[PDB]
């Protein structure tokens, strides 16, 4: 080496514990009376929802 | 009723946010300066009874309504396309304590609001019903939120308020934005400005033109897809807005990215005509190809047929050869017909086929790879067997199957189909690439041809834009279209009466602006070149009748002024020699580049000065720029794994480049360095502040608050409008300003202290007074007179020097020639990093995007091509930039050279740094630069004298030891050549030179001696 | 780092001139709350032979 | 001469106004000499100033004052030295049409460029957008204007070039004129 | 053609705008070549030199 300085490389500092979010809360749409509701459809009720 | 709208229309593109930055967009917006129809009742209705005379218009681009009826009146906008129960419906109306969204089908509506309200009495009544929809059998989907508590609050503004409610359907996610806009108003004025957010987003993207709004008095738009500059604040709300297209100012706003039009010209554009009614024009015969064996081995031709039907025979799905655009084909023009087929099987279709390998190939039949189409569907065994086959290469039959010992030889496709060659007779593509005459082509309608007036042809198929000139070039026997040049097609022989014609490219040029600055920038003067400009007859009237001609020259028609035979000068260039003001207005003229004179000439009067002055000036050299640094891997990577391999498939390129880089940086301290490493010692001037008269308060850096600086610095910093974000930074610069600061102090102290010695040795100190005297004898002017004038001389100067303070704080514009330098720097590394807006076609800009966009394989090719663009973008500015490097080192070194030449000592060489005979010279600091001043002895107030080339006495020619003769017609005098002071003649100040003998000019006076 | 600017319904990330994201939403609980780039620069070594 | 996406913008100044500069400073210099250099032209007479530039050069005026007439006459033969050996010998303009050469021979290479088709099938961009869809000709429109790119790219670079060496040499003609027109250095071969 | 240039980047107004730099360059050149005298001077008719 000669008398001089010599960009060798970089750094980065880095990061921890990538995370990731995203809208509001997380929920679901209402499938107790599609699945907790005591009366349903029948052979002939039944509507492709 | 039409109404021009002052400033509507304005809502922000996305959920963006900027500040105080001009941004682009682009949408179907509220044209600028457009009718608008505004009404309030035909007829007397909306308050009992219906009346009216005839009916709500479509949707061309976009939907924009609103009134300002402090009611529902405005009771529904109606979106869709049919509107019955064939489309559902879109309606959206207020539900009386809330709104609701309908799309289901019904009968009609009614007047949702009568106007007496208040009822009759204490409750009720409940008389004036109202009704929207009817019989709720097939309904789609409704939707609530609150526009009422959200969007009117037309409340405790007792009347008259202003909303707005625009539409736009953008790609489906059927968005709308709104605003409660309130102004107290009080009748007839349209105007206010504002934005829109979007309230909803119903992503239906469902058929939408029809928007019938139901309650007389609507105000309806009809938006246009126009891209628009806007600027933000930092609240978040816009301040003003121009589209980028609608005068022939918004484009100059839009691209100097300004909402400030400075003094000059900037070519925007120019300007392609619009062609009237293209032309067709094909051949008479008409007649298809043989089909016998096809529809309904050899070759054949004569086909110009209708290839729709029997094209896509729904034996296929569709016709879907790879190698045909039958979306287009039908439309082209060909020169051949090559029609070969020969029992092969048809399902094996990748079998034979381009990307041809095996048996059938080698052996049989594999014709080479030329763009072609493929062969339909059909049984043929049982639908009419033993049929056989045929290594060998293409175009090649043989009879007798010699030795290739051998195997069972033959092979059947029979009637056993079940099987993986089911029949096909194999059909080819017919294709010639231009290389002969044109004949082949399926007849449309084959329009009649015009001429002379510059209209696009899709002539026998070849098409192009430009005029039709019957060729007077006697064409020969053999030539359907040449070319002058490298693609520029010339021949035009038409396909039915063989007749042949020209084409040149109808004339164009730029378009660009002439105007003094944007505070009168009312009056936007336009340009086109060097044309005869009758084809754009929508101004020149309007300027041939504020408006008085419209007058062309050699650079081209100028509509935008007119012309006058005053002769000014060169302020704004237009071309060929006519530069821009006057009577206060824009005009054009001839330039009068100096004051049209000469003064006179003589044999025996010279024009010596008797009074001067000391000037001085200013010049401002760039020495520097900010030592970027950049580095491949981060930029195209910024933390990325497949982005670093990718780039060390390159090599050491983006190496090579940082590597250069840090070489300029090296080299423009360098630069720095050379600029000012011009003594090695430092120094102080003395504190001693007494300097004959001469006055430098503004310079010399005694303690003054900020360090030792210089009062013209001050002005000078902010008077320069002068952070990193990623991929780049900039090194700091290495030597500091202040170490500038001090080099230049000691320097221009030592200079003005010790006279010049310094850089011949030891800094002999001197005494400024002497100093003077000195420069003054090296520029051919006695220092008697300067010993005479001190005091005068020293107040010129510092009056001088306080002129050029003033001048700096009130001549704007002084530092183009560095604030241009700063400029460019920046401006360059804003374009460089804005490139990665550019995403190349990708799918998107941030290579993170894409590669979680897809799988590893195609975004590998994928980022490739980010990586290309990126690559050869930054590429490009590791170019532009070292060409700047090569403009400013010249600069450079010219800069060094100078301070070296005009300060340390004191030159002849005028024009460098002085206007006349040059004294000397000042150097200062700036912020990537550096600045210096000068001192020039300019003469002022000549006079005229009788002067003699020689004298004679005693017969002997007396020559002027050094000076010039001069009389006032009585006496004549011996005097220097720079400043009147005549002298008496005797021996010394002049010596002989023989007998007064030949030359002319010689005048009869007598020399003498004291 | 802290968020000083002011947003609407509207607007969702606010970059900056340069056009460079940095203003996060935030959407649990309405609170935008800006970023930066962590910072880093070259390396290299001095010797004198 | 201009023939299609090119052109050519005529110079500033036409020649009519160049050479008015010029001739205004010949006859200024044949009469009022260095003091226009400065600001006001100041009249001289001719035969006197030719004599203080025998001073400058290293000779006391007298030898032309006796000298004249055949420094005249030389002068004068002098003079039209130079134009029959002009007129009769052409190549004298070397550089000059070596860097017109150099620009316009470029520009043909420019345009001559786009008589390559960079692998991709057509010559005539508008042939491959008719000849199939362009959902698939696009890419060799992609071919196409990034070679034509990357070619016009070049051309402004070295344009730029030539800019540099023209510019720097200009400065230099600048200061040449000066110092060898509103007064006489003593730079021999400058 | 411009359809899918305008898919990349602004190299376009790059080069125009460094070339019309070039121009007005040269233009300034011809200027500091020449431009250096105020009025325009008239030689006389009288040629007795
Ligand atoms: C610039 O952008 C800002 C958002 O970044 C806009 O919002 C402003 O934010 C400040 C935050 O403190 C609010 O200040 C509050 O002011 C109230 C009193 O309101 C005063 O102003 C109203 C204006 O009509 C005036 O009528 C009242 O009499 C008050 O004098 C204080 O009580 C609070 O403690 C708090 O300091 C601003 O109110 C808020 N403005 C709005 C409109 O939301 C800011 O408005 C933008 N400025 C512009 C566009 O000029
Ligand atoms: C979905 O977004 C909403 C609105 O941002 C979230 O509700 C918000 O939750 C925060 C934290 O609980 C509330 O802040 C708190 O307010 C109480 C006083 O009411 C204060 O004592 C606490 O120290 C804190 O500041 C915020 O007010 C609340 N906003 C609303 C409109 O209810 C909600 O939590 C997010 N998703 C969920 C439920 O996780
Ligand atoms: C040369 O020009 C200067 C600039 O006007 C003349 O300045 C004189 O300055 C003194 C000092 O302020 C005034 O009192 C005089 O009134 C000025 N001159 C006149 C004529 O009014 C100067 O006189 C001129 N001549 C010389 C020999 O210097
Ligand atoms: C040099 O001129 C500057 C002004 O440009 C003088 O600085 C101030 O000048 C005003 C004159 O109106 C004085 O009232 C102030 O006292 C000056 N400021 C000081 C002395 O700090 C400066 O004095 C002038 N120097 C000379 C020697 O005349
Ligand atoms: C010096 O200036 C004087 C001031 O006018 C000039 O005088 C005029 O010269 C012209 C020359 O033909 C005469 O026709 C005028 O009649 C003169 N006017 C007066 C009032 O005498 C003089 O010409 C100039 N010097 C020279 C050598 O011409
Ligand atoms: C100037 O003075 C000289 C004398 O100093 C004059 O010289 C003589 O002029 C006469 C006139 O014909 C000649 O014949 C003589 O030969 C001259 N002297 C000599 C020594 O040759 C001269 O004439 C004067 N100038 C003018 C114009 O008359
Ligand atoms: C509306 O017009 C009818 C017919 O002229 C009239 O009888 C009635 O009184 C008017 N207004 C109301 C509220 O009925
Ligand atoms: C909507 O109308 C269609 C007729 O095309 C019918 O088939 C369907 O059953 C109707 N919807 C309901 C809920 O009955
Ligand atoms: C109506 O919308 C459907 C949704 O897929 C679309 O396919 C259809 O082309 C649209 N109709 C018209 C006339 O655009
Ligand atoms: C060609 O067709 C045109 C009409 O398309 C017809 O008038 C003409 O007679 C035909 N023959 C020739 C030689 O033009
Ligand atoms: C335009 O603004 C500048 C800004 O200083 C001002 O000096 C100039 O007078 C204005 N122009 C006109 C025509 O008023
Ligand atoms: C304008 O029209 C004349 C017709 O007399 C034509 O000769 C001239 O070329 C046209 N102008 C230009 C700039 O060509
Ligand atoms: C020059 O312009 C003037 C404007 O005052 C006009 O009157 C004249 O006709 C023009 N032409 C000349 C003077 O030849
Ligand atoms: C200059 O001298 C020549 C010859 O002596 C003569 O033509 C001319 O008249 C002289 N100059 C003047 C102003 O008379
Ligand atoms: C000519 O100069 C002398 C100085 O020696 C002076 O005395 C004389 O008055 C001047 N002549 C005129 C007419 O001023």
Same mark, same amino acid.
């Not at chain 2, 119903?202 to 628009?228: D, E, K, M, S, W």
């Not at chain 2, 070519?267 to 619009?274: A, C, D, L």
């Not at chain 2, 302020?571 to 054009?588: H, N, R």
């Not at chain 2, 000195?774 to 300067?786: A, K, S």
């Given at each position: ?49 | 009723?039409?109404? !021009? ?78 509107? @019955? ?22 009968? *009609? ?17 409940? /008389? ?111 301040? @003003? ?64 047929? @209708? ?162 000139? /019957? ?9 359907? *279209? ?66 008085? !001609? ?68 200013? /010049? ?74 001469? !006055? ?29 974000? !990623? ?60 010993? /005479? ?222």
């Amino acid at each position: 080496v000669e008398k001089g300085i010599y960009q060798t490389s970089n750094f980065r500092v880095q990061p921890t514990e990538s995370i990731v979010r995203f809208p509001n809360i997380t929920n679901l749409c209402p499938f107790g009376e599609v699945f907790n509701a005591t009366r349903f459809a029948s052979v002939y009720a039944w509507n492709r929802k | 009723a039409y109404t !021009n709208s002052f400033t509507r229309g304005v809502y922000y593109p996305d959920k963006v946010f900027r500040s105080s930055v001009l941004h682009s967009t682009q949408d179907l917006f509220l044209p600028f300066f457009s009718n608008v129809t505004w009404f309030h009742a035909i007829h007397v209705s909306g308050t009992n009874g219906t009346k009216r005379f005839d009916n709500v218009l479509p949707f061309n681009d976009g939907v924009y309504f609103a009134s300002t009826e402090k009611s529902n009146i405005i009771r529904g906008w109606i979106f869709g396309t049919t509107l @019955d129960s064939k489309t559902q419906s879109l309606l959206i109306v207020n539900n009386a304590t809330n709104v609701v969204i309908k799309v289901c089908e019904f009968q *009609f509506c009614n007047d949702p609001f009568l106007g007496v309200y208040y009822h009759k009495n204490n409750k009720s009544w409940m /008389e004036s019903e109202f009704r929207v929809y009817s019989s709720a059998n097939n309904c789609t989907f409704e939707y609530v939120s609150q526009p009422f508590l959200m969007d009117l609050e037309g409340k405790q503004g007792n009347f008259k308020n202003l909303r707005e409610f625009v539409f736009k359907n953008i790609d489906g996610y059927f968005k709308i934005y709104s605003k409660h806009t309130p102004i107290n108003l009080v009748r007839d004025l349209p105007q206010g400005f504002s934005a829109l957010e979007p309230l909803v987003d119903l992503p239906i993207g469902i058929n939408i033109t029809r928007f019938q709004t139901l309650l007389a008095a609507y105000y309806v738009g009809y938006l246009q897809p126009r891209t628009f500059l806007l600027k933000y604040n930092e609240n978040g709300t816009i301040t @003003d807005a121009v589209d980028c297209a609608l005068d022939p100012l918004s484009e100059t706003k839009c691209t100097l990215k300004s909402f400030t039009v400075e003094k000059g010209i900037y070519q925007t554009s120019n300007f392609r005509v619009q062609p009237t009614e293209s032309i067709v024009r094909f051949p008479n015969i008409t007649n298809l190809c043989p089909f016998g064996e096809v529809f309904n081995r050899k070759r054949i031709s004569n086909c110009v047929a @209708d290839y729709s039907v029997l094209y896509n025979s729904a034996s296929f799905s569709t016709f879907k050869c790879y190698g045909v655009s039958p979306t287009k084909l039908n439309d082209l023009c060909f020169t051949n017909v090559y029609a070969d087929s020969f029992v092969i099987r048809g399902d094996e279709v990748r079998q034979i086929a381009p990307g041809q390998t095996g048996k059938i190939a080698d052996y049989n039949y594999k014709l080479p790879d030329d763009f072609t189409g493929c062969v339909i569907a059909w049984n043929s065994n049982n639908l009419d067997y033993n049929y056989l086959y045929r290594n060998l290469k293409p175009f090649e039959r043989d009879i007798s199957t010699e030795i290739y010992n051998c195997y069972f030889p033959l092979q059947s496709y029979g009637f056993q189909p079940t099987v993986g060659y089911q029949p096909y007779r194999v059909v080819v593509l017919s294709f010639e690439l231009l290389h002969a005459p044109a004949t082949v082509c399926g007849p449309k309608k084959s329009t009649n041809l015009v001429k002379n007036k510059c209209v696009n042809f899709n002539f026998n198929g070849l098409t192009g834009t430009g005029v039709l000139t /019957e060729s007077n070039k006697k064409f020969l026997p053999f030539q359907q *279209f040449g070319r002058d040049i490298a693609d520029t097609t010339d021949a035009v022989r038409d396909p039915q009466t063989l007749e042949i014609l020209d084409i040149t490219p109808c004339s164009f040029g730029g378009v660009s602006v002439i105007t003094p600055g944007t505070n009168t920038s009312n009056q936007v003067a336009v340009l086109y070149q060097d044309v005869n400009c009758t084809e754009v007859p929508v101004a020149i009237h309007a300027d041939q009748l504020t408006g008085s !001609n419209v007058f062309q020259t050699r650079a081209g028609c100028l509509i935008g002024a007119e012309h006058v035979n005053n002769s000014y000068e060169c302020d704004i260039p237009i071309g060929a020699g006519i530069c821009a003001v006057a009577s206060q207005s824009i005009i054009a003229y001839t330039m009068s580049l100096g004051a049209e004179n000469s003064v006179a000439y003589s044999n025996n009067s010279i024009a010596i000065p008797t009074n001067f002055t000391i000037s001085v000036t200013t /010049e401002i050299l760039p020495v520097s720029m900010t030592k970027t640094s950049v580095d491949c891997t981060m930029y195209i990577c910024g933390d990325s794994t497949e982005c670093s391999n990718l780039l060390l498939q390159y090599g050491s390129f983006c190496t090579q480049l940082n590597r250069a880089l840090t070489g300029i940086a090296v080299e423009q301290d360098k630069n720095t360095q050379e600029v000012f490493a011009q003594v090695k010692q430092i120094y102080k001037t003395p504190p001693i502040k007494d300097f004959g008269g001469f !006055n430098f308060s503004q310079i010399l850096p005694d303690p003054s608050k900020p360090s030792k600086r210089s009062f013209i610095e001050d002005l000078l910093f902010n008077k320069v409008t002068l952070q990193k974000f !990623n991929g780049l930074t900039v090194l700091p610069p290495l030597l500091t300003d202040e170490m500038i600061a001090q080099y230049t102090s000691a320097l221009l102290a030592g200079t003005i202290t010790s006279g010049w010695t310094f850089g011949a040795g030891a800094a002999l100190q001197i005494p400024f007074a002497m100093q003077m005297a000195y420069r003054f004898n090296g520029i051919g002017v006695t220092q008697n007179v300067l010993y /005479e004038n001190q005091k005068l001389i020293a107040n010129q100067f510092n009056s001088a020097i306080g002129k050029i303070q003033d001048s700096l704080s009130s001549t704007a514009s002084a530092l183009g020639k560095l604030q241009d330098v700063v400029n460019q720097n920046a401006q360059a590394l804003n374009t460089l990093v804005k490139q990665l807006s550019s995403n190349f076609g990708a799918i998107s800009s941030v290579l993170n995007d894409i590669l979680s966009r897809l799988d590893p394989p195609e975004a590998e090719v994928q980022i490739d091509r980010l990586i290309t663009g990126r690559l050869q973008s930054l590429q490009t500015y590791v170019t532009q930039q070292l060409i700047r490097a090569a403009e400013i080192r010249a600069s450079a070194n010219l800069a060094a050279t100078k301070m070296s030449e005009c300060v340390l000592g004191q030159s002849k060489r005028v024009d460098f740094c002085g206007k006349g005979y040059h004294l000397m010279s000042f150097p200062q600091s700036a912020p990537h630069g550096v600045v210096f001043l000068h001192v020039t002895y300019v003469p002022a107030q000549e006079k005229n004298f009788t002067t003699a080339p020689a004298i004679c006495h005693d017969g002997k020619a007396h020559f002027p030891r050094e000076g010039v003769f001069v009389s006032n017609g009585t006496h004549w005098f011996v005097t220097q050549r720079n400043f009147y002071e005549p002298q008496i003649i005797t021996t010394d100040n002049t010596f002989v030179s023989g007998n007064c003998d030949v030359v002319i000019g010689i005048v009869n006076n007598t020399v003498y001696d004291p």
